[PDB]
Every structure is written in structure tokens, then in C-alpha cells.
Design a protein around this ligand. Structure first.
Ligand SMILES: Cc1ccc(NC(=O)c2ccc(CN3CCN(C)CC3)cc2)cc1Nc1nccc(-c2cccnc2)n1
Ligand SMILES: O=C(Nc1ccc(OC(F)(F)F)cc1)c1cccc(CN2CCOCC2)c1
Ligand SMILES: [Cl-]
Length: 285
């Protein structure tokens, strides 16, 4: 099986024994994900397993990750799926999730230039997924990771029934993150790359505020109705007008009127080619 000679060969399949399983990750906030070590590489990894009908979504997540490779998407390193317990192994990201990272970070270090950089990296991963005709479905700061030198990667932790609190709430027989969810997704169950664009705009606001909770002090039962009547979050303090214009574009009612990720990414790279975000932020302020 493990030998290139076999018909049953999969390059992604690895030796379970090759990995030393340590403790659960982030105190359990990610479910059955464990810090690990790849012995031979002396490399920390993150290892997702199954806890005791649920097999095929896990195997399909494995299937999908084999299909995608981007600098800004968390990288599959291997699998153990020949026999239970099934593993999915990715790289481990030193600074953990972007949401907590934003709230806990030193702001002298994580300045406007670094925030812009973080938003840019995310838009590139999304450009890639756009181009490969994938949809993310739960784009948000809580689903991104941060490594060395402000490297940001887009992940998908499957958080809807793992996260405690009111982030995800019951809607349509399932748990939605209501404050990140595009109107057509809440109203008509319509999910697409353009509804990832809406969530990206909310993600952008999370970056701009250092991970404040969106629509702060607004009841969830009121979000759709406000949105339908053209309400949007106001420009965060310090936010350059152009970045806010970009947020406003992502939050078009009609999905078709939302920029594609390629255009979003193109705007980040253009927006400050001749003027620094630092000057704009200080101007705003
Ligand atoms: C261990 C593992 C197993 C699987 C995954 N998977 C993904 O992150 C992922 C990313 C993108 C897609 C693309 N996909 C397209 C289709 N739509 C519908 C879903 C998303 C799928 C899975 C990540 C991990 N990594 C992971 N998980 C939880 C926590 C951590 C972690 C925590 C702290 C520091 N370093 C790493 N790391
Ligand atoms: O950096 C800021 N905003 C911002 C917005 C968008 C943005 O672009 C992108 F693409 F989203 F990343 C980048 C940065 C910022 C926010 C609050 C306070 C201060 C400085 N002040 C310090 C003293 O106290 C008062 C505030 C700066
Ligand atoms: Cl998809």
C-alpha cells in the first residue's frame, strides 16, 4: 500500500506511527484537533481526528484539501485514512487564530501596514478558491491562522457546533454565524463565492477594529431587517475611506453587484501603490 509500486498508493497517506500525538489544541475550542510532532522532521503539526454517518464529510474535507494549494491556505501535510482513527495533518501556525491574535496583539507591531497585509493575504487565498470554483462558507477571523512574520492563512475549522456562545445561532435547521452571513444566504439558503465576498467584508471590518464583534449591541433578530433597509456598519475609526468603500462594495445587497475576489485583491495592491496606509490612517485620525 505505502510503496509507489502498489495500485493502492496515495502520496498523501502517511505512517500514523511517524506522528507523536500530544495535547488537544487551544484548550478544546477546535474539537478533536491535537498538537502533534512529525518525528523525522522535528516539526509541530495540527492533527484533526474523529471522536467516537459522520465519516464521509471528514473524508470529503480530506478529498478537498488534496485539491488545493496556496501560500495563504493552511497546507495539508498528509492523512491517515486507510483505517480508523482517521487523521488529517496540516502545518501548525505559531500565533494561532487571527481573531484572538488581533485582540491580543501589540499594536505598535500590528500597525495599519500589517493589517493591510493580513487582508491582502486573505483576499489572495479567496481569489484562488474563487478561481478553482470552491466556496468557503464560513469566512471569518476565527477561521484564519497567523504564523511567523504576519503570515496569514485561511482555514476551515468546522466551528458551527463546536463554538460556545452566540457566534453561531440556530437558523434553518443548522447553526449560522448570523453576523457574517450574506442576506441571500439567511433568506434563501443561497451560498456562493459572492456570499464569501459578503463575509470577507465583515472579516475586513474585524481586521480594521482589531477583532471587535460586528454590529456591536445590535440584536441578531434585527440584522436581516436592518440590512434589507440599507443599514451597514459605520466606517471604523482610523479606517481609510478606500478600505471602507471596499467593505461597502462587499456588502452590496445584490450578490452580482459585489466585487469578485480577483478585483478585491487587485484593489489592495493598487489602493496604496502611491500613498501609505499610515498617512491615510493618520489623515483620517
Ligand atoms: C488539523 C486540520 C485539519 C483540517 C483542516 N482544514 C482546513 O482548514 C480547510 C481549509 C479550507 C478548506 C476549503 N473548503 C472548501 C469547501 N468549503 C465548503 C469548505 C472549505 C477546507 C478545509 C485544518 C487543520 N488545521 C487546524 N485545525 C484547527 C486548528 C489548527 C491550528 C490551531 C493553532 C495553531 N495552528 C493550527 N489547525
Ligand atoms: O490601523 C487602524 N485602522 C485600519 C483600518 C483599515 C486597514 O486596512 C485593512 F485592509 F483593513 F487592513 C488598516 C488599518 C487603526 C485603528 C484604530 C486606531 C489606530 C491608531 N490610533 C492609536 C491611538 O489611539 C487612537 C487610534 C489605527
Ligand atoms: Cl465548494
Amino acid at each position: 500500500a505505502m510503496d509507489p509500486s502498489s495500485p493502492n498508493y496515495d502520496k498523501w497517506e502517511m505512517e500514523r506511527t511517524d506522528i507523536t500525538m500530544k495535547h488537544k489544541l487551544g484548550g478544546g475550542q477546535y474539537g478533536e484537533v491535537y498538537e502533534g510532532v512529525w518525528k523525522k522532521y522535528s516539526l509541530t503539526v495540527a492533527v484533526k481526528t474523529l471522536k467516537e454517518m459522520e465519516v464521509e464529510e471528514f473524508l470529503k474535507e480530506a478529498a478537498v484539501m488534496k485539491e488545493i494549494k496556496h501560500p495563504n491556505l493552511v497546507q495539508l501535510l498528509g492523512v491517515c485514512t486507510r483505517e480508523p482513527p482517521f487523521y488529517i495533518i496540516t502545518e501548525f501556525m505559531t500565533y494561532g487564530n487571527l481573531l484572538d491574535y488581533l485582540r491580543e496583539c501589540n499594536r505598535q507591531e500590528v500597525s495599519a501596514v500589517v493589517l493591510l497585509y493580513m487582508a491582502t493575504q486573505i483576499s489572495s487565498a479567496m481569489e484562488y478558491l474563487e478561481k478553482k470554483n470552491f466556496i468557503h462558507r464560513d469566512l471569518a477571523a476565527r477561521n484564519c491562522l497567523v504564523g511567523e512574520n504576519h503570515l496569514v492563512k485561511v482555514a476551515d475549522f468546522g466551528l458551527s457546533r463546536l463554538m460556545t456562545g452566540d457566534t453561531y445561532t440556530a437558523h434553518a435547521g443548522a447553526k449560522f454565524p448570523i453576523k457574517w452571513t450574506a442576506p441571500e444566504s439567511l433568506a434563501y439558503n443561497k451560498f456562493s463565492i459572492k456570499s464569501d465576498v459578503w463575509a470577507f467584508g465583515v472579516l475586513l471590518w474585524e481586521i480594521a477594529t482589531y477583532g471587535m464583534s460586528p454590529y456591536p449591541g445590535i440584536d441578531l433578530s434585527q440584522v436581516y431587517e436592518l440590512l434589507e433597509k440599507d443599514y451597514r456598519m459605520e466606517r471604523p475609526e482610523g479606517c481609510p475611506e478606500k478600505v471602507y468603500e471596499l467593505m461597502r462594495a462587499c456588502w452590496q445587497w445584490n450578490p452580482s453587484d459585489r466585487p469578485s475576489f480577483a478585483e478585491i485583491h487587485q484593489a489592495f495592491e493598487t489602493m496604496f501603490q502611491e500613498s501609505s496606509i499610515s498617512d491615510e490612517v493618520e489623515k483620517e485620525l
